[PDB]
Amino acid sequence: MTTHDRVRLQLQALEALLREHQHWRNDEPQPHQFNSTQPFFMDTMEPLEWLQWVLIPRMHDLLDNKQPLPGAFAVAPYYEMALATDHPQRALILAELEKLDALFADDASLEHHHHHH
Known part of the structure; x- marks a missing residue:
């Protein structure tokens, strides 16, 4: 089973937790929230709005791109x-x-298997 895939499931597990304990936030792509360019967007909004909307989908793409x-x-x-x-x-x-x-x-350690030796 793909490691990057299991972490995806983890993201959905957190999503499920926010689904039961409905505190899910849906932003209408406000660049102001990202152009602060803070690691956790601490001053741009509550640090809780980083976990969802940003972190989860951000990691979805990261996992898919085979990124370490x-x-x-x-x-x-x-x-x-x-x-x-x-x-x-x-x-x-x-x-x-x-x-x-x-x-x-x-x-x-993700093994670096080149196309040719």
């Missing part, structure tokens, strides 16, 4: 602070995050 997974990609430690402790059910989201991050920390 960022070895130190970890958003769980970020949202651990970005998402207040006042909502204990955040563990559900964090578990999905730590699981996602665990996939980026899973595939470390």
Whole structure:
């Protein structure tokens, strides 16, 4: 089973979580949100609107383009602070995050098989 494909499923697992706990956001391609060019768009909007709409579809294309997974990609430690402790059910989201991050920390070395030696 394709590694880049399983991470796609993970993205859909997070999507499913946002489907049950309906907090899904749909932006009408506002360039203002991206032309800030921040890693997490912290000042452009709430750090929560980075996880969905941006991260999920962004990774969809990345996975498809056979691109190697960022070895130190970890958003769980970020949202651990970005998402207040006042909502204990955040563990559900964090578990999905730590699981996602665990996939980026899973595939470390993609073999470079050239077309000819």
